[PDB]
RNA sequence: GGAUUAAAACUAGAGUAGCGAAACGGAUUCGAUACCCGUGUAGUUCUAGUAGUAAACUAUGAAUACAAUUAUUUAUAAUAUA
């Protein structure tokens, strides 16, 4: 599950995603499909 | 020991005898051995291809031939020690013959241990007089063993009706079960017919085993009484 | 078995299987043909052919051949 | 491998069949089809086993005692009995070649006639034949075999076998059908057979016997149904009885010299 | 009747479900199994041969006491069955435990 | 050519085996392939192996491990009786019932598609294949699996975000359930059909179907009576059953409410005598063992009516009437709480 | 002797403890487990629950039950009755705990 | 250390058991003597109850005290070893 | 049981040895000799077992 | 050339239980300047140093390239069900 980990003891992939904006990028992508696009 | 020299040179020593005059009459084997020269090399002989699997013995894969990256993520740019060292020993060491059939055979016999209990005759008989079409497992002149399953599996693989080996093995074993079912049912039904129509049997397997157990247990009885006498005597002391 | 291999016979080995060496039947057949020819040659020459086998059970074959 | 033996004049038997007894198609069914079926069945049954090296007769003798080996016993018995039957109904035992062997028909020997005389209260061979057909039609309710056999007492007698029995070995004669009702005397016969078996002094559970077959007739429908049809097995047996290879029968008889 | 009670030294107790042969009843079977009596339960249940580091147990006198005699001496490798490395580490741990005083 | 022939040779058909020839532990099924010889070959000491078996071996059967050894001898044993045990079992003719386990292995079914049972545990088992050494063997297998799943990381990412972002934004356990399902199908992919060594079916002991009847001249057979022996005069300690030797197999024997006085008379020597047993059932166990239940048959003809005796086999659970109500405290606890309040 | 013989003895020790006019029998109990260990008999929930009765302190009983789950992995109506009886729970307390169970 | 190691001997001039031990049979006559004397010790000198044992010893020592001798048994392991040593020693090929 | 305990712990032989002093070199040579003799005895046991088995199987 | 170099030795401090050259007594002997027993010095111990020899031996100086086979144990490398 990688950066999508919800476990207490995450791995370095979460920090990598932060420094890469990967998590924020995916989050805004999905949110833009959800609320603005109504999907 | 030494690669001896005189046994293969009997002819020349006898020829020297004859020419010098030591021996008057020429031996009967003289001309025969002269016409049929003996083998006289006695040399080691290198081998390059294993005939069982087909692997080639005596070839490297140089750096130029692995331009891609290794499983660890590195590009091999220089020879490793294993390559740098010589390997003449491999050429002269007899190859280890290997077959993909052995894995299947072992798997079958550790899935069906009691199949080992069905006796197998290991004395061959004209192994060059077998004509088997392995579309069907039943073959004239051979029993219904695990080798039938193996040969059926490799026929399926060779003629490409299935993919990986487990599919063909599964199909072959599911045919094997049906054939065995038929056989055992035939055995039981024939026995019941004979007993219906009045066939009489002197001894059955169970009572044969009982007889053997009795012939063992009598000896066990005598041994136990004698030993218990001995140990009672020792304990009393 | 491999553990009793005499290295001087390295030319007659086809491989090793089940923990024992396998002789090359092609070489066996060639050498057997030559041996048969030489024994036949002495037979015509009228010589004396002596078959020697001491291991148990070989008497029948030796006697029949002789 | 057990392969069907080559019968003499096979071309003749295949083209027209045995005369006065079976048609070409019927003889095809009885031998070139049934024997092949039986032999392949036996080969598949006994492949990879010590029994593969023995003839059917020795196979049945060895397997008689063992209960579970009933398939191989029955197969071997059927093969042997069928070959016995076909051999005794062969027209010409030996191929004619350049000799006119067909000019003379075979007849029973005076020794055989005397044997019948002593064995059946001095009754005629035709009387014995009619009694034989009566017994065959009255005893064998389904498939089976009919035998005229000779025992160690130097006296012939008649034996009826159900399905696949053997004249040679008496506990496997299969003479009695226990499916239907049975009589007190027959039950006593089975009981004394059991006692004689119990008298055996070997782990193999075998009892000596020397009942040899002089004449054999197959009652399996594979032989008669095609030509004679349902319910005409009596006529079929009559016909085969009247037409036989008395050279073979006499050779089976024991001369003593 | 005669003597009616016997010990277990010479009477084979067949386990349930196990397949057997007539020979098992003979006196020979008892000699054979006493001759080939190998303690494979120890092989299965031994922690050291499992793979764990023997030196890791230096604070476990209870575990270490199973590899010493009653008096406290250490069994030879022929008895313990351990590898050379495992035996050396185990003796090292034992001797240490003795030094600290836990054992 | 020659290697191709050797592959099919009869010697090659025997699977490699080096398990002990002399073994004292519990035995549940055969461990070696029986090699036999015809009388003609036995007379000439030929068995088909490399060496000629010595003359004093008068039996036509044997087992072996090595064709030749450094000691210039063939490791063999003039034995082989598991064939006789199997034939005796066939004589007993009690088919093996597939208790608990459904879907008799010898038959193909279409029920496998119905695979919904805690697949995560099975996948954990399959990952932990190298069960030998926890710090080394399972560790390296786990590392291999870890590399594979790191490689498969990204596809799961997109698949989840595309399918069920709702589970992501609600941070529910459906997420881990979906991980299980995803890896399940990735394990259904190729290179995963795998080979299983686990004992399937009877293992060749018998190929029988439950349901067919045995017919005898005295009428269709209703009960199977076979001889046997009593090993222990006293039932197993803590247990209410004895052990009996029946056709090569030890069976759990029950008593008809009374041990025969022959037991008290013969004591520990009871193995000498033979008794009659009726096989109730035969079943299997995961270890490959065959567990068969038998009942002792003591003829009660011209005996007492077994009065002044208790019932040993009798269920007190014949209370389906009591089962009809819940009796789970779910509502009884409510009633009792009402009592606590005072009603 | 079987398991029953030993556990029967325990009941005797329970009688002594209930009417304690002698030394504390804990050492006798220990001696008897040593005896049954030497005899090789296999323990059973009955023997275990008897020991539970022997226990005194709450954390001890807690460890007893948790160890039970670890190794024996089986409970019974007898044991739940035993714990309810021994815990000195009020009537409503027993009611609530059994309802939850 | 999967299984215990196997130890090989060097080339030896001979394989021989110096003194072979034989499973000697116990002698009931000395057993009788021992049990009679033990009975005297247990139940007093000249125990009336063991007069039967006195009679058994009487019978077993009426003639030669040892009893009777049928055969003297000793092993043949030395012969078998001498015969099989060269074959089983696994020496390198000559 | 006492006797077996002391025999298996080699208490008696140890007591006999400790009565007098021996040089380290002599101790080492004695240790090597004893180990060799034990090794040789185990090997001889194995060979005799092989002989007995071969006799039992007819070789 | 240089450094290290077991016992036994030697120069200074401390230390000295046990063992033990010498020395004095027991015994054994024809004698016994010894083998055995008793009391025991110097030594054996630690710290500073001096000296650089032993059956200091594998009686075999070091390095490099090669040559036919078996067994065991050692580490690491996987067929892959293991
Ligand atoms: Mg380099
Ligand atoms: Mg220099
Ligand atoms: Mg030193
Ligand atoms: Mg000083
Ligand atoms: Mg002195
Ligand atoms: Mg210096
Ligand atoms: Mg000097
Ligand atoms: Mg010098
Ligand atoms: Mg040295
Ligand atoms: Mg050097
Ligand atoms: Mg250097």
The Cα angle at residue C23 between residues C17 and C29, in degrees rounded to 5: 145
The whole-angstrom distance between H23's CA and the closest CA on chain F is 24
Distance CA F176, CA B84 (A): 51
Alpha-carbon distances of H48 from B128, H38, H39, rounded to whole Å: 88, 13, 10
Chains that touch E (3 or more CB pairs under 8 A): B, F, H, I
Distance CA F329, CA G99 (A): 6
Kindly give the residue spans of alpha helices, DSSP state H, lying in chain F.
2-8, 10-13, 39-43, 82-92, 119-127, 137-163, 165-170, 174-188, 261-266, 320-323, 332-341
Q: How many CA atoms lie within 13 A of F232 on its CB side?
A: 21
User: Are D109 and D246 spatial neighbours (Cβ–Cβ below 8 Å)?
Assistant: yes
Distance CA B77, CA B72 (A): 14
Alpha-carbon distances of F202 from F85, F132, G64, rounded to whole Å: 14, 27, 43
Dihedral over Cα of I11, I17, I18, I22: its sign: negative
Q: Is C48 helix (H, G, I), strand (E, B) or coil?
A: coil
* Placement of tokens 């072959």 in the chain: B172
User: Are D119 and D154 spatial neighbours (Cβ–Cβ below 8 Å)?
Assistant: no
Residues of chain A contacting F161 with CB distance shorter than 8 Å: 26, 30
Dihedral over Cα of I17, I21, I24, I29: its sign: negative
SS3 sequence of F165-201 = HHHHHHCCCHHHHHHHHHHHHHHHCCCCCCCCCCCCC
Alpha-carbon distances of F67 from C1, D48, E81, F14, F21, rounded to whole Å: 8, 21, 30, 11, 14
Domain extent, residue E88, equals 46-102
Distance CA I51, CA I45 (A): 10
Distance CA F175, CA A1 (A): 9
Instruction: Bin H46: left if φ > 0, else alpha if -120 < ψ < 50, else beta.
Output: left
The sheet with strand B120-121 has its strands ordered as B120-121, F35-36, F61-66, F75-77
Distance CA D190, CA B144 (A): 38
Distance CA B190, CA D82 (A): 19
Q: Is residue E26 less than 8 Å (CB to CB) from chain B?
A: yes
Q: At what angle do helices G3-18 and G26-39 cross, to 10 degrees?
A: 180
Ligand nearest the Cα of residue B85 is 1
Q: Is F245 helix (H, G, I), strand (E, B) or coil?
A: strand
- For residues H48-71, b (16+ Cβ closer than 10 Å) or e, as one string? eebeebbebbeebeeeeeeeeeee
Q: What are phi and psi of F293, to 5 degrees?
A: -100, 135
Question: Do F and H count as touching (3 or more CB pairs closer than 8 A)?
Answer: yes
The string of DSSP codes covering E24-63 is GGSHHHHHHHHHT---HHHHHH-SGGGT--GGGGTT-HHH
Distance CA B88, CA B83 (A): 12
Closest CA to F187 of F158, F137, F152: F152
- Tokens linked to B203: 């001894």
CA of residue H76 to C1' of nucleotide J25, angstroms = 64
The set of residues, in sequence order, having a beta carbon less than 8 Å from that of D81 and lying 6+ positions away, is D145, D164, D166, D216, D218
Residue in chain C nearest F11 by alpha carbon: C18
* Helices then strands, each counted (H, E), chain G: 6, 0
Closest CA to B194 of C59, D179, H23: D179
CA dihedral F41, D46, F15, C18 (to 10 degrees): 30
Give the B window 48-77 contacts with C, CB below 8 Å: 50-52
The length of chain I is 59
User: Are F98 and C49 spatial neighbours (Cβ–Cβ below 8 Å)?
Assistant: no
Distance CA B27, CA C42 (A): 10
DSSP-assigned beta bridge partners for residue D216: D147
The string of DSSP codes covering F55-81 is TT---SEEEEEES--TTSS-EEES---
Tell me whether residue D200 is exposed, middle or buried, using C-beta atoms within 10 angstroms of its C-beta: 0 to 12, 13 to 18, 19 or more.
Answer: middle
Distance of alpha carbon B21 from its chain centroid, rounded? 57
Q: What are phi and psi of C7, to 5 degrees?
A: -65, -15
β pairing state of F290-296 and F75-77: unpaired
Residue D196 has what DSSP assignment?
A: H
Distance CA G90, CA G97 (A): 10
Distance CA D116, CA D132 (A): 13
CA of residue B64 to C1' of nucleotide J67, angstroms = 34
Interface contact A4-F171, CB threshold 8 A: no
- Tokens linked to B109: 């016999």
Q: Is residue B213 less than 8 Å (CB to CB) from chain E?
A: yes
Distance of alpha carbon D237 from its chain centroid, rounded? 13
Distance CA E16, CA B189 (A): 31
User: Are F74 and F51 spatial neighbours (Cβ–Cβ below 8 Å)?
Assistant: yes
Distance CA C35, CA F185 (A): 66
Largest Cα span, chain I: 54
Strand J-proximal protein residues, Cβ less than 7 Å: B 44, 86, 88-89, 92-93, 103; C 2-5, 7, 10; E 83-85; F 70, 129-130, 132, 194-195, 197; H 1, 3, 5-6, 8, 90, 92; I 21
Tell me whether residue B172 is exposed, middle or buried, using C-beta atoms within 10 angstroms of its C-beta: 0 to 12, 13 to 18, 19 or more.
Answer: buried
The string of DSSP codes covering I7-42 is HHHTHHHHHHHHTS---HHHHHHHHHHHHHHHHHHH
Resolution, Å (one decimal): 3.0
The Cα angle at residue F272 between residues F268 and F278, in degrees rounded to 5: 100
Distance CA D189, CA B21 (A): 93
Q: Is residue C64 less than 8 Å (CB to CB) from chain F?
A: no
Distance CA H76, CA I55 (A): 11
Method in brief: cryo-EM
CA dihedral D57, D62, D68, D70 (to 10 degrees): 10
Instruction: Count F/H contacts: CB-CB distance under 8 Å.
Output: 9
Q: At what angle do helices A12-20 and A22-34 cross, to 10 degrees?
A: 70
Distance CA D168, CA D61 (A): 8
User: Are F36 and F60 spatial neighbours (Cβ–Cβ below 8 Å)?
Assistant: yes
Element (H, E) at D144: strand D144-150
Q: Is G40 helix (H, G, I), strand (E, B) or coil?
A: coil
Give the B window 26-85 contacts with F, CB below 8 Å: 51-52
Distance separating the N- and C-terminal Cα atoms of chain D: 37
- Tokens linked to F202: 């009877």
Question: What are the CB-based long-range contacts (under 8 Å, 24+) for D209-212?
Answer: D209/D168, D209/D169, D209/D170, D210/D151, D210/D152, D211/D149, D211/D150, D211/D151, D211/D152, D211/D159, D211/D167, D211/D168, D211/D169, D211/D170, D212/D149, D212/D150, D212/D167, D212/D168, D212/D252
Q: Is residue B7 less than 8 Å (CB to CB) from chain F?
A: no
Element (H, E) at D248: helix D246-252
Distance CA B36, CA F304 (A): 96
The set of residues, in sequence order, having a beta carbon less than 8 Å from that of B136 and lying 6+ positions away, is none
Alpha-carbon distances of A18 from A2, A4, A15, B191, F175, rounded to whole Å: 13, 12, 5, 80, 21
């Amino acid at each position: 599950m990688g950066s999508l980990s919800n476990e207490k003891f995450f791995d370095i992939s979460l920090v990598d995603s932060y420094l890469n904006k990967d998590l924020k990028n995916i989050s805004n992508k999905i949110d833009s499909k959800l609320n603005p696009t109504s999907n | 020991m030494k690669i001896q020299t005189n046994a293969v040179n009997v002819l020349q020593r006898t020829s020297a005898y004859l020419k010098s005059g030591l021996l008057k009459e020429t031996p009967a084997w003289y001309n025969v051995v002269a016409s049929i020269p003996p083998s006289t090399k006695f040399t080691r002989e290198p081998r390059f291809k294993n005939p069982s699997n087909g692997h080639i013995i005596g070839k490297l894969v140089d750096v130029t031939e692995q331009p891609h990256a290794n499983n660890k993520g590195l590009y091999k740019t220089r020879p490793n020690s294993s390559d740098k060292r010589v390997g003449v020993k491999r050429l002269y060491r007899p190859p280890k013959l290997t077959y993909v059939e052995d894995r299947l055979r072992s798997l079958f016999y550790k899935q069906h241990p009691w199949e080992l209990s069905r006796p197998k005759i290991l004395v061959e008989n004209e192994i060059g007089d077998e004509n088997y079409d392995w579309s069907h497992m039943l073959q004239i002149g051979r029993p219904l063993d695990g080798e039938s399953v193996i040969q059926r599996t490799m026929y399926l693989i060779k003629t490409k009706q299935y993919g990986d080996m487990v599919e063909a093995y599964d199909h072959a074993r599911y045919e094997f079960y049906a054939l065995r079912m038929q056989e055992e049912t035939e055995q039981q039904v024939a026995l019941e017919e004979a007993e219906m129509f009045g066939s009489l049997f002197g001894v059955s397997a169970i009572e044969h085993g009982i007889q053997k157990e009795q012939e063992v247990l009598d000896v066990w009885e005598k041994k136990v009484v004698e030993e218990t006498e001995l140990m009672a005597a020792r304990t009393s002391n | 078995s491999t553990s009793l291999w005499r290295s001087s016979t390295q030319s007659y080995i086809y491989g090793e299987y089940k923990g024992i060496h396998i002789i090359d039947l092609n070489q066996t057949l060639s050498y057997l043909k030559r041996a048969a020819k030489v024994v036949e040659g002495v037979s015509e020459s009228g010589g004396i052919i002596l078959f020697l086998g001491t291991r148990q059970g070989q008497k029948r074959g030796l006697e029949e051949a002789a | 491998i057990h392969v069907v033996p080559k019968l003499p004049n096979s071309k003749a038997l295949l083209q027209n069949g045995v005369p006065n007894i079976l048609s070409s198609s019927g003889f095809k069914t009885v031998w070139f089809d049934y024997q092949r079926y039986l032999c392949d069945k036996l080969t598949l049954a006994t492949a990879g086993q010590s029994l593969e090296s023995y003839y059917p007769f020795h196979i049945l003798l060895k397997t008689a005692g063992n209960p579970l080996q009933s398939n191989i016993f029955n197969l071997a018995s059927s093969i042997h009995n069928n070959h016995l039957f076909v051999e005794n109904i062969l027209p010409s035992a030996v191929e004619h070649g350049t000799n006119s062997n067909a000019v003379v028909k075979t007849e029973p020997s005076r020794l055989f006639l005397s044997k019948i005389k002593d064995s059946f209260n001095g009754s005629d061979w035709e009387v014995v034949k009619e009694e034989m057909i009566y017994r065959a039609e009255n005893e064998v309710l389904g498939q089976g075999w009919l035998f005229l056999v000779e025992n160690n007492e130097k006296k012939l007698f008649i034996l009826t076998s159900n399905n696949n029995g053997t004249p040679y070995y008496f506990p496997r004669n299969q003479s009695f059908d226990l499916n239907s009702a049975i009589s007190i005397d027959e039950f006593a016969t089975l009981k004394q057979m059991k006692e004689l078996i119990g008298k055996s002094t070997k782990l193999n559970g075998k009892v000596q016997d020397w009942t040899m077959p002089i004449i054999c007739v197959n009652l399996w429908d594979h032989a008669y149904l095609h030509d004679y049809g349902v319910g005409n097995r009596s006529k079929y047996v009559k016909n085969v009885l009247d037409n036989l290879n008395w050279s073979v029968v006499n050779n089976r008889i024991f001369s003593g010299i | 009747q005669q003597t009616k009670k016997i010990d277990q030294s010479l009477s084979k107790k067949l386990p349930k479900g196990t397949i057997y042969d007539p020979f098992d009843f003979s006196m020979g079977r008892i000699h054979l199994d006493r001759k080939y009596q190998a303690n494979k339960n120890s092989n299965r249940n031994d922690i050291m041969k499992s793979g764990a580091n023997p030196l890791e147990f230096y604070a476990r006198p209870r575990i270490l006491s199973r590899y010493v005699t009653s008096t406290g001496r250490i069994q030879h490798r022929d008895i313990t069955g351990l590898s050379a490395k495992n035996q050396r580490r185990l003796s090292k741990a034992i001797r240490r435990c003795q030094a600290i005083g836990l054992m | 050519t020659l290697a191709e022939l050797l592959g099919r040779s009869r010697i090659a058909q025997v699977a490699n085996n080096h398990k002990p020839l002399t073994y004292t532990g519990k035995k549940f099924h055969p461990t070696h392939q029986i090699i036999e010889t015809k009388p003609s070959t036995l007379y000439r000491q030929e068995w088909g192996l490399k060496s000629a078996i010595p003359s004093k071996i008068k039996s036509r059967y044997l087992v072996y491990n090595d064709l030749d050894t450094l000691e210039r001898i063939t490791t063999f044993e003039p034995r082989g009786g598991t064939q006789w045990n199997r034939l005796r079992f066939q004589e007993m003719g009690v088919p093996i019932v597939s208790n608990i386990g459904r879907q008799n292995p010898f038959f193909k079914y279409i029920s496998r598609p119905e695979d919904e049972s805690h697949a995560k545990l099975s996948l954990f088992k399959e990952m932990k294949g190298d069960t030998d050494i926890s710090p080394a063997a399972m560790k390296k297998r786990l590392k291999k699996i870890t590399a594979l799943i790191r490689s498969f990381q990204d596809e799961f990412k997109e698949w989840l975000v595309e399918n069920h972002p709702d589970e992501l934004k609600l941070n529910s356990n459906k997420l881990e359930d979906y991980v299980v399902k995803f890896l399940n199908k990735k394990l259904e992919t190729k290179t995963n059909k795998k080979f299983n060594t686990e004992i399937i079916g009877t293992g060749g002991l018998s190929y029988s179907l439950p349901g067919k009847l045995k017919n005898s001249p005295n009428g269709v057979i209703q009960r199977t009576v076979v001889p046997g022996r009593i090993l222990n005069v006293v039932k197993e300690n803590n247990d209410n059953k004895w052990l009996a030797a029946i056709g090569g197999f030890v069976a759990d024997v029950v008593f008809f409410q009374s041990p025969p006085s022959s037991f008290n008379s013969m004591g520990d020597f009871i193995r000498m005598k033979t008794f009659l047993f009726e096989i109730l059932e035969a079943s299997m166990e995961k270890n490959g063992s065959v567990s068969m239940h038998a009942r002792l048959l003591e003829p009660q003809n011209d005996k007492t009516r077994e009065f002044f005796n208790k019932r040993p086999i009798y269920k007190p659970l014949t209370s389906r009437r009591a089962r009809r109500p819940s009796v789970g405290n779910i509502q009884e606890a409510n009633n009792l709480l009402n009592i606590i309040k005072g009603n | 002797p079987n398991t029953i013989t030993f556990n029967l003895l325990l009941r005797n020790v329970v009688k002594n403890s209930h009417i304690r006019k002698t030394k504390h029998p804990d050492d006798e109990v220990l001696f008897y487990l040593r005896s049954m260990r030497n005899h090789g008999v296999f323990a059973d929930v009955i023997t275990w629950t008897t020991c539970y009765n022997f226990l005194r302190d709450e954390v001890s009983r807690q460890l007893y039950i948790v160890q039970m789950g670890e190794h024996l992995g089986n409970f019974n109506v007898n044991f739940v009755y035993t714990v309810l009886r021994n815990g000195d729970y009020r009537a409503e307390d027993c009611l609530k705990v059994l309802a939850a169970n | 250390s999967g299984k215990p190691p196997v130890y090989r001997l060097p080339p030896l001039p001979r394989l021989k058991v110096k003194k072979p031990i034989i499973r000697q049979e116990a002698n009931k006559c000395l057993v009788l003597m021992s049990n009679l004397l033990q009975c005297w010790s247990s139940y007093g000198h000249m125990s009336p109850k063991c007069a039967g044992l006195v009679t058994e010893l009487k019978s077993c020592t009426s003639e030669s005290a040892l009893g009777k001798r049928n055969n003297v048994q000793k092993s043949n392991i030395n012969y078998h070893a001498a015969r099989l040593y060269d074959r089983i020693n696994g020496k390198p090929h000559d | 049981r006492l006797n077996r305990i002391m025999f298996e712990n080699n208490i008696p032989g140890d007591k006999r040895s400790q009565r007098f002093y021996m040089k380290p070199g002599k101790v080492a040579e004695l240790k090597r000799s004893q180990r060799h003799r034990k090794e040789f005895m185990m090997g001889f046991k194995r060979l005799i077992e092989i002989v007995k088995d071969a006799k039992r199987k007819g070789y």
